[PDB]
Design an enzyme around this catalytic site. Structure first.
Site, PDB file in Angstrom:
ATOM      1  N   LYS A 125       0.879   3.731  -2.302  1.00  0.00           N
ATOM      2  CA  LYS A 125       0.212   4.946  -2.735  1.00  0.00           C
ATOM      3  C   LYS A 125       1.150   5.840  -3.550  1.00  0.00           C
ATOM      4  O   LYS A 125       1.363   7.026  -3.269  1.00  0.00           O
ATOM      5  CB  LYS A 125      -0.396   5.711  -1.538  1.00  0.00           C
ATOM      6  CG  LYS A 125      -1.360   4.863  -0.734  1.00  0.00           C
ATOM      7  CD  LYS A 125      -2.208   5.724   0.204  1.00  0.00           C
ATOM      8  CE  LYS A 125      -3.335   4.906   0.849  1.00  0.00           C
ATOM      9  NZ  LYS A 125      -4.169   5.796   1.682  1.00  0.00           N
ATOM     10  N   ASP A 181       0.866  -1.208   0.000  1.00  0.00           N
ATOM     11  CA  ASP A 181       0.000   0.000   0.000  1.00  0.00           C
ATOM     12  C   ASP A 181       0.889   1.241   0.000  1.00  0.00           C
ATOM     13  O   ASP A 181       0.838   2.052   0.911  1.00  0.00           O
ATOM     14  CB  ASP A 181      -0.922  -0.100   1.215  1.00  0.00           C
ATOM     15  CG  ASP A 181      -2.014   0.936   1.332  1.00  0.00           C
ATOM     16  OD1 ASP A 181      -2.316   1.643   0.359  1.00  0.00           O
ATOM     17  OD2 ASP A 181      -2.617   0.988   2.441  1.00  0.00           O
ATOM     18  N   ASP A 191       3.633  10.380  -7.555  1.00  0.00           N
ATOM     19  CA  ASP A 191       4.631  11.310  -8.103  1.00  0.00           C
ATOM     20  C   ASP A 191       4.530  11.253  -9.628  1.00  0.00           C
ATOM     21  O   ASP A 191       3.675  10.539 -10.199  1.00  0.00           O
ATOM     22  CB  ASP A 191       6.005  10.944  -7.550  1.00  0.00           C
ATOM     23  CG  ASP A 191       6.968  12.109  -7.392  1.00  0.00           C
ATOM     24  OD1 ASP A 191       7.070  12.976  -8.312  1.00  0.00           O
ATOM     25  OD2 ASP A 191       7.652  12.144  -6.352  1.00  0.00           O
TER      26      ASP A 191
END
Ligand code: U5P
EC number: 2.4.2.10
Length: 256
Positions: A91, A89, A94
């Protein structure tokens, strides 16, 4: 509305999604353990004991105090033994050029051991393009964060619609969503829902909880992600079984 086992055979299914859906059906589990611990030994003891009860083990590798790639080798042994996927996880959030390196490289080498990762859609589709350059050759899948469980989430309305379109346009790599509900009408996509406890409540930092019956049964999601509801319990095996049975029956009763 198809069973997990039938969805595993859909023409457009991703191989990672198919593997997951088949083991969900075989083991009667739509529970993802959120293994939010700081010790490798605790992570591995949870993975071994709860492995039979879960379809997936979700990690935050960046909170393990004693991470090594050998710990992840040991976690893969357990994943193969007990039949569950590993979901980091992370996430990713960028520009494409940066996330490709954060996925493949550094100390964690996430792509080498994670069946699934996830990404925020806020940077635009370059985040998916960058990840997929590493993940497609490594036969991996990705989940897009379409809705969040936390108070003040901005992942609503047009944002959620943008996440669904980005997923449905990158189906070679994107296999589903982090969401609070069914957001895609296409059954080839998975819906995984965090912010789940049996009891009403929240935490002191914006987490909000809903029950398995609410998010699987009423909101039409596929998989519950449960951290503290299991991890903070004394008997984590029994807690995992309670969450498994809740999510599985909500799914069945939804199916008819
Ligand atoms: O919208 C989201 C996406 C991810 N998570 C993650 O899922 C877990 C929830 O844990 P808990 O609140 O069940 O302990 C945590 O690892 C958190 O980082 C959420 O809670 N909400």
């Amino acid at each position: 509305e198809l069973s997990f086992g039938a969805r595993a055979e859909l023409p457009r299914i991703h191989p990672v999604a198919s593997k997951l859906l088949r083991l969900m059906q075989k083991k009667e589990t739509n529970l993802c353990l959120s293994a939010d611990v700081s010790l490798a030994r605790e992570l591995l003891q949870l993975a071994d004991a709860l492995g039979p009860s879960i379809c997936m083990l979700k990690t935050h590798v960046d909170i393990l105090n004693d991470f090594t790639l050998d710990v992840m080798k040991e976690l893969i042994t357990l994943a193969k033994c007990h039949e569950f996927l590993i979901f980091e996880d992370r996430k990713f959030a960028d520009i494409g050029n940066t996330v490709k390196k954060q996925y493949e490289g550094g100390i964690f080498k996430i792509a080498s051991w994670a069946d699934l990762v996830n990404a925020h859609v806020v940077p635009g589709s370059g985040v998916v393009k960058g990840l997929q350059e590493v993940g497609l050759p490594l036969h991996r899948g990705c989940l897009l964060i379409a809705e969040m469980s936390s108070t003040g989430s901005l992942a609503t309305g047009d944002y959620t619609r943008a996440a669904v379109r980005m997923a449905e346009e990158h189906s070679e790599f994107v296999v589903g969503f982090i969401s609070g509900s069914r957001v895609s009408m296409k059954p080839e996509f998975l819906h995984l829902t965090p912010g789940v406890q049996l009891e009403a409540g929240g935490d002191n930092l914006g987490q909000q909880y809903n029950s398995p019956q609410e998010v699987i049964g009423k909101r039409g999601s596929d998989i519950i992600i449960v951290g503290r509801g299991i991890i903070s319990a004394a008997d984590r095996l029994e807690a995992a079984e309670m969450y498994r049975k809740a999510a599985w029956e909500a799914y069945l009763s939804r199916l008819g």
